[PDB]
A paper describes a structure:
On the other hand, the other two crystal forms (forms I and II at 1.78 and 2.25 Å resolutions, respectively) contain two stoichiometric UDM1–K63-Ub2 complexes in the asymmetric unit. No large conformational difference in UDM1 or K63-Ub2 was observed between the two crystal forms or between the two molecules in the asymmetric unit. LRM1, UMI, and MIU1 fold into a single-continuous α-helix, whereas K63-Ub2 adopts an extended conformation. LRM1–UMI binds K63-Ub2, where Ubdist and Ubprox interact with LRM1 and UMI, respectively (1250 Å2 and 1090 Å2 buried surface areas in forms I and II, respectively, averaged over the two complexes in the asymmetric unit). On the other hand, MIU1 binds Ubdist of the adjacent K63-Ub2 in the crystal. Electron density corresponding to the linkage between Gly76 of Ubdist and Lys63 of Ubprox in K63-Ub2 is discontinuous, suggesting its structural flexibility. Leu116 and Tyr120 of RNF168 LRM1 interact with the Ile36-centered hydrophobic patch of Ubdist in K63-Ub2 (left). Tyr145, Ile146, Leu149, and Leu150 of RNF168 form a hydrophobic surface to interact with the Ile44-centered hydrophobic patch of Ubprox (left). The Cα–Nε distance between Leu71 of Ubdist and Lys63 of Ubprox varies from 12 to 16 Å in the different complexes in forms I and II. Note that the Cα–Nε distance between Leu71 of the UMI-bound Ub moiety and Lys63 of the MIU1-bound Ub moiety in the crystals of the UDM1–K63-Ub2 complex is estimated to be 24 Å in form I (Lys63 is mutated to Arg63 in this structure), which is longer than the Cα–Nε distance of K63-Ub2 at full extension (~20 Å).
In the current model, the E3 Ub ligase RNF168 recognizes these polyubiquitylated proteins and then ubiquitylates histone H2A, which serves as a recruitment signal for 53BP114–19. Recognition of ubiquitylated products by RNF168 relies on three distinct UBDs: MIU (motif interacting with Ub) 1, MIU2 and UMI (Ub-interacting motif [UIM]- and MIU-related UBD). Currently, it is postulated that UDM1 and UDM2 interact with different ubiquitylated targets: UDM1 is associated with RNF8-dependent polyubiquitylated targets, whereas UDM2 recognizes RNF168-dependent monoubiquitylated targets. In UDM1 and UDM2ΔC, the simultaneous interactions with Ubdist and Ubprox provide the specificity for K63 chains.
Residue numbers in the entry:
A (entry chain A): 110 to 188
B (entry chain C): 1 to 76
C (entry chain B): 1 to 72
């Protein structure tokens, strides 16, 4: 008894629901990826800070050691 | 000749056909009327799916016979 | 089959692929549009990093799926 477009409009409404389910399914996929990336970049930022901190303490200890040698030197060359 | 086409939600349409019309022809008539793509349509009569290359007379579809229409629904 | 690749800058590029394409094919297609060498590309889908030898259908990647590009 289908009026102009009545079957047509059920078809369009039913296609819309299939599309909405795909978008819902994709949202779960894309939120897993976006939280994965957040963690990955945070872990790589922490690693580089740890490396840079290791470099800083090595340079600071070299400085102290250089001064230790320098004092033993200056006492030897001036008396 | 008038035949009727019915979906699983209870809706019925009327089509003007000739027994020598193929099923592909019928599905094109349904497209022109309801905007459903032929490759999304499945038609059923007398316990079988109707193949595109066969005619209505091949399946003994006559005046005021009722076909069932099943829609393939595609987001993909 | 069309899929999307999202960069950290937020832009989206579109790729034409087939289910049989490997992740390595996809990195080559990203190279062709962005100029990024494949060996600097990490690809992520559904929260996991994709392996070069496996195929898109191996990961259930289908049309209008979104892959995420993160550079090494
Ligand atoms: O591998 C991804 C799976 O997770 C959901 O999105 C779907 O059921 C599958 O595609
Ligand atoms: Mg037409
Ligand atoms: Mg190339």
């Amino acid at each position: 008894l289908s009026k102009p477009g009545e079957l047509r409009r059920e078809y369009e409404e039913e296609i819309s629901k299939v599309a909405a389910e795909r978008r819902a399914s994709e949202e779960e996929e894309n939120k897993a990826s976006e939280e994965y990336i957040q963690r990955l970049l945070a872990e790589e930022e922490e690693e580089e800070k740890r490396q840079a901190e290791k470099r800083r303490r090595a340079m600071e200890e070299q400085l102290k050691s250089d001064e230790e040698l320098a004092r033993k030197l200056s006492i030897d060359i001036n008396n | 000749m008038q035949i009727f086409v019915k979906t699983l939600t209870g809706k019925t349409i009327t089509l003007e056909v000739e027994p020598s019309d193929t099923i592909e022809n019928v599905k094109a008539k349904i497209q022109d009327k309801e905007g459903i793509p032929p490759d999304q349509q499945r038609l059923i009569f007398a316990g079988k799916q109707l193949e595109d290359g066969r005619t209505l007379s091949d399946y003994n579809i006559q005046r005021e016979s009722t076909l069932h229409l099943v829609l393939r629904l595609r987001g993909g």
